[PDB]
Design a protein around this ligand. Sequence first.
Ligand SMILES: NC(=O)c1ccc[n+]([C@@H]2O[C@H](COP(=O)([O-])OP(=O)(O)OC[C@H]3O[C@@H](n4cnc5c(N)ncnc54)[C@H](OP(=O)(O)O)[C@@H]3O)[C@@H](O)[C@H]2O)c1
Ligand SMILES: O=C(O)Cc1nn(Cc2nc3cc(C(F)(F)F)ccc3s2)c(=O)c2ccccc12
Length: 315
Amino acid sequence: ASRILLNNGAKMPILGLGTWKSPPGQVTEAVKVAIDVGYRHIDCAHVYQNENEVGVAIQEKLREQVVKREELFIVSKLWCTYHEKGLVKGACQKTLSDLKLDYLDLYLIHWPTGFKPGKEFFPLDESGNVVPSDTNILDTWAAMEELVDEGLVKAIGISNFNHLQVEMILNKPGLKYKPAVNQIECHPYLTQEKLIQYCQSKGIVVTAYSPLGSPDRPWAKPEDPSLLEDPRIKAIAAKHNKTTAQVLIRFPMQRNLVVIPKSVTPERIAENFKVFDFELSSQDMTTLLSYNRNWRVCAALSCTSHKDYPFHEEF
Ligand SMILES: NC(=O)c1ccc[n+]([C@@H]2O[C@H](COP(=O)([O-])OP(=O)(O)OC[C@H]3O[C@@H](n4cnc5c(N)ncnc54)[C@H](OP(=O)(O)O)[C@@H]3O)[C@@H](O)[C@H]2O)c1
Ligand SMILES: O=C(O)Cc1nn(Cc2nc3cc(C(F)(F)F)ccc3s2)c(=O)c2ccccc12
């Protein structure tokens, strides 16, 4: 089954295309090839600095009538420097204009931490600590709710929120809309069993990012563990006559997660989609879960003293 029901009553494709690090001169073609071979969900963000080029591809496939807008599920995220009440609508509208959309299907608070507003995405003090904004998760959440009530977004959600931060929103005085999704890092080295059961128990769908362990992350070190080169995972792939990436994509699908592998390589974009025709066993699933080592692609050092940094807390 290709889609999962959200608590806003809409259906979300469980496979989407990631766009973080997709070069602006390549992502248009990447998104066009992806829609041609079946993707109907694209994961975007203003901080990725490529939403205009993503939008060009979306607009072209709509114009070509390859797909209808109702058949696409387009996600974007509010960056940290825009948590302030007065900046949220403009931020969303800039994303909308760049993506050539009149609404988003899902708009996420990208990280629970607000940063000082301005031109800089990572405003720093002279010792390299991020400069916080005094804004809190709950006021930001009300501003997201306003977007729903203005018709600019169909669903709102969060990303990189821990257990206690999710609970903070679920317990918000006057909460009007629950988060639909919590998009978090998740792969066999960061299996997230506690956070996932909590969110799922509450009707919040979980999206897994960096499902392949983000081999193109700009801060990679050779001594880091490598999912795609892990012989243990490679063995499971071989047994199923699939590639290691295919196994790494099907794994979160079977945990009732949405997953958003990034590629700009047309052959891989198609390979990554061919994951609805094979099943990992229970034993495979528990074996992959056993590889957890709480290793994170995404946890910027410059942010670890922010009041709302999410990853001190166990989950
Ligand atoms: N919410 C957030 O904070 C957050 C954080 C991180 C990521 N995300 C989202 O999650 C998406 C996916 O995460 P990610 O970009 O970090 O990494 P990823 O999807 O885990 O890995 C992307 C890397 O894998 C390569 N790759 C793709 N398919 C492959 C295949 N079949 N075989 C071998 N290599 C393959 C890509 O190469 P090519 O592109 O050269 O093919 C690229 O180097 C992002 O792009 C973004 O949309 C969200
Ligand atoms: O953001 C993505 O989508 C990918 C992403 N991840 N990271 C690692 C990060 N670690 C963080 C930690 C916090 C924190 F909440 F923990 F304070 C807040 C914000 C971040 S960004 C980056 O540094 C980054 C830089 C440019 C574009 C995308 C990203």
